[PDB]
Design a binder for this molecule. Structure first.
Ligand SMILES: Nc1ncnc2c1ncn2[C@@H]1O[C@H](COP(=O)(O)OP(=O)(O)OP(=O)(O)O)[C@@H](O)[C@H]1O
Lengths: 284, 9
C-alpha cells in the first residue's frame, strides 16, 4: 500500500472542479506518475462520492494501451489519491487547436486508435459517455490515452443490460438518445466518435452554438453540414456514425459490431494489429 | 467511508 510520503510532488498538471492532478516521482523507484488528488470533505459535501467510486471501479477493469492506467489508489485523513500513468503530451484538443485541421493520414491514424480503444471498451461492456478530445490524452510517443471514467458505466452482464440511465456527458458530443429517451448505450460513444472525426477534419465539432439548449436542438434534428474539401471517405464514415437511430450506427451491436466499422473504406490502409507499436504520423 | 477505495494493480 502506497502512502503520500512515498512520493515527491512536482508541478500541477491540471485542475478539475473537484480534483487536482500533480506530477509525482515515486522515491523508491524513480517512476513518474500523474496523481489525481481529491479532498474528502469537498467530495462528501458536494455529493461526488459516487463519481469517485465509479472512476476507481471502471479504471480497475481496464488494461489496454490506449487508456490511462490506474496503478494504485490510497488515502489519508483528508484526501484520496489516484496514481495514473502520465500522458506527457496532454490533450488531443490542444493539437486540433494548434494545427487547425488534421490531414488525412493523421485523421485516419488517430481515428483508428480511437476505434480500437472503443472496441476494447465495448467488448468489456463499458460505455464511456463523455468521449471528446479533452478526454483523449497523448503519451510521450503520441499514442492516445483515453481518460475520465467517473461518468462511465459498466453494463451488467447478468441482466444483459444495454441501456444506462444517468444523465452525463458534454453537450457538443451528447447523443440524441440521451436527450430524447433519457438513456445511453454503447452506440452513444459511436455518435461521439463521429463528432470527433468531424472535428479533426473541420476544426470544430459539428453541432455548435453559444449555449447548450441550442446545441441540443440541433443534435435532435441532425442539423449540421460539412465544410468544403472534407475528405470524401471520412465524410461517408461520419454520415454512418451521426445517425439519429442508435441501432443504425456503423460499429453498433445491431449493425454487427466492429468488423464492419474497421472495414470501412476510410481505413483501407490501416493495420489494426499492433497500432500501439506503430510510429504515429507527425502532426503538421 | 471510502473503505473500499484503496487499490493496487
Ligand atoms: N493521466 C494524466 N496525465 C497527464 N495529464 C492529466 C492526466 N489526467 C488528467 N490530466 C490533466 O489534468 C486535468 C484535470 O483532470 P481531472 O480529471 O482532475 O479534471 P477534469 O476532468 O479536467 O475536470 P472536470 O472534472 O471539471 O471535468 C485534465 O484536464 C488533464 O489535462
Amino acid at each position: 500500500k502506497k502512502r503520500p510520503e512515498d512520493f515527491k510532488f512536482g508541478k500541477i498538471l491540471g485542475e478539475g472542479s473537484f480534483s487536482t492532478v500533480v506530477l509525482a516521482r515515486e522515491l523508491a523507484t524513480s517512476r513518474e506518475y500523474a496523481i489525481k488528488i481529491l479532498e474528502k470533505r469537498h467530495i462528501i459535501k458536494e455529493n461526488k462520492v459516487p463519481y469517485v467510486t465509479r472512476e476507481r471501479d471502471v479504471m480497475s477493469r481496464l488494461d489496454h494501451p490506449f487508456f490511462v492506467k490506474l496503478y494504485f489508489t490510497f488515502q489519508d485523513d483528508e484526501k484520496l489519491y489516484f496514481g495514473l500513468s502520465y500522458a506527457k503530451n496532454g490533450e488531443l484538443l490542444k493539437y486540433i487547436r494548434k494545427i487547425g485541421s488534421f490531414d488525412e493520414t493523421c485523421t485516419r491514424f488517430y481515428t483508428a486508435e480511437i476505434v480500437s480503444a472503443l472496441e476494447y471498451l465495448h467488448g468489456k461492456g463499458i460505455i464511456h459517455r463523455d468521449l471528446k478530445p479533452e478526454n483523449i490524452l497523448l503519451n510521450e510517443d503520441m499514442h492516445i490515452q483515453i481518460t475520465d471514467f467517473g461518468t462511465a458505466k459498466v453494463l451488467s452482464p447478468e441482466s444483459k443490460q444495454a441501456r444506462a440511465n444517468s444523465f452525463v456527458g458534454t453537450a457538443q458530443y451528447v447523443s440524441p438518445e440521451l436527450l430524447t429517451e433519457k438513456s445511453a448505450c454503447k452506440s452513444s460513444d459511436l455518435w461521439a466518435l463521429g463528432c470527433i472525426i468531424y472535428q479533426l477534419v473541420a476544426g470544430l465539432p459539428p453541432f455548435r452554438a453559444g449555449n447548450e439548449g441550442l446545441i441540443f436542438a440541433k443534435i435532435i434534428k441532425l442539423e449540421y453540414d460539412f465544410p468544403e474539401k472534407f475528405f470524401p471517405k471520412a465524410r461517408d464514415l461520419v454520415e454512418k456514425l451521426l445517425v439519429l437511430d442508435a441501432t443504425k450506427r456503423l460499429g453498433c451491436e445491431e449493425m454487427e459490431g466492429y468488423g464492419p466499422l474497421k472495414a470501412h473504406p476510410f481505413f483501407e490502409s490501416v493495420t489494426w494489429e499492433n497500432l500501439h507499436q506503430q510510429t504515429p504520423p507527425k502532426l503538421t | 467511508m471510502f473503505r473500499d477505495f484503496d487499490y493496487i494493480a
